[PDB]
């Protein structure tokens, strides 16, 4: 029951929660999430490019038919922030941690328009995060990046580590280039602490695992040490 627009697939997970799926020209999926919620619709990370992060928002007005409200961004790479000019041209407004947006010309992404902060419980500082309706934002530490950021979605079992958690039988922690290989397990553990319930993980590059991949993660992660 996937659905193709153009270069992206989406997967229901919920019955107002999609996994999008784009791919880096051999072919490199990235997920990312769409999020029903009454009568908007908020996304989870863009697509690798601007063209795909636009298809994303046309399969949206095509398939739900709401209005794209908000979008959150979960840190300064390619696979989550390449698209930020396409949302902008969409007129959504736009949300990453605040260091992720002072690292964006870094790591040649355009910044969000807002900056999000954080507590030192990795919890969002909630007037930074103005109407996300069920989207907890939380940091769990420093991970896959410095700035890595996850979401769970409220009123479902789901949710969302980005590129910092990988799936239960992987091999690898992936792409290590820009990592805190000291703090990683912990980070990968403090997600998992924060939405003890979920039991549907969402990640970057694997299909949606069980929590056995934030465990596993962190395995691997240890024996970065
Ligand atoms: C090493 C493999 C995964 C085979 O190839 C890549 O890394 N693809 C990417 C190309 C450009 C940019 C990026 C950024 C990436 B993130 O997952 O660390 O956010 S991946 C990636
Ligand atoms: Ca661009
Ligand atoms: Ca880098
Ligand atoms: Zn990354
Ligand atoms: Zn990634």
Not at 202 to 223: E, L, N
């Amino acid at each position: 029951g996937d659905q193709r627009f153009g270069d992206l697939v989406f997967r229901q997970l919920a019955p107002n929660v999609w996994q999008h799926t784009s791919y880096l020209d051999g072919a490199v999926a990235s997920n990312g999430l769409i999020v029903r919620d009454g009568g908007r619709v908020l996304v989870v990370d863009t697509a690798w490019t601007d063209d795909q992060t636009a298809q994303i928002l046309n399969w949206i007005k095509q398939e739900i038919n709401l209005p794209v409200a908000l979008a959150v961004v979960t840190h300064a790479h390619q696979d989550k922030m390449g698209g930020m000019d396409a949302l902008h041209a969409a007129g959504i407004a736009t949300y990453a941690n605040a260091l992720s947006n002072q690292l964006a010309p870094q790591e040649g992404m355009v910044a969000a328009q807002h900056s999000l902060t954080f507590a030192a419980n990795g919890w969002v500082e909630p007037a930074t995060a103005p109407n996300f309706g069920p989207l907890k934002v939380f940091y769990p530490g420093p991970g896959h990046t410095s700035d890595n950021i996850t979401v769970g979605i409220d009123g479902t079992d789901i949710a969302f580590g980005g590129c910092l958690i990988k799936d239960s039988k992987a091999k690898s922690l992936g792409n290590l280039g820009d990592a805190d290989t000291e703090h990683y397990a912990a980070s990968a553990r403090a997600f998992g602490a924060a939405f003890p319930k979920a039991s549907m993980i969402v990640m970057s590059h694997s299909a949606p695992d069980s929590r056995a991949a934030i465990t596993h993660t962190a395995r691997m992660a240890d024996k970065l040490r």
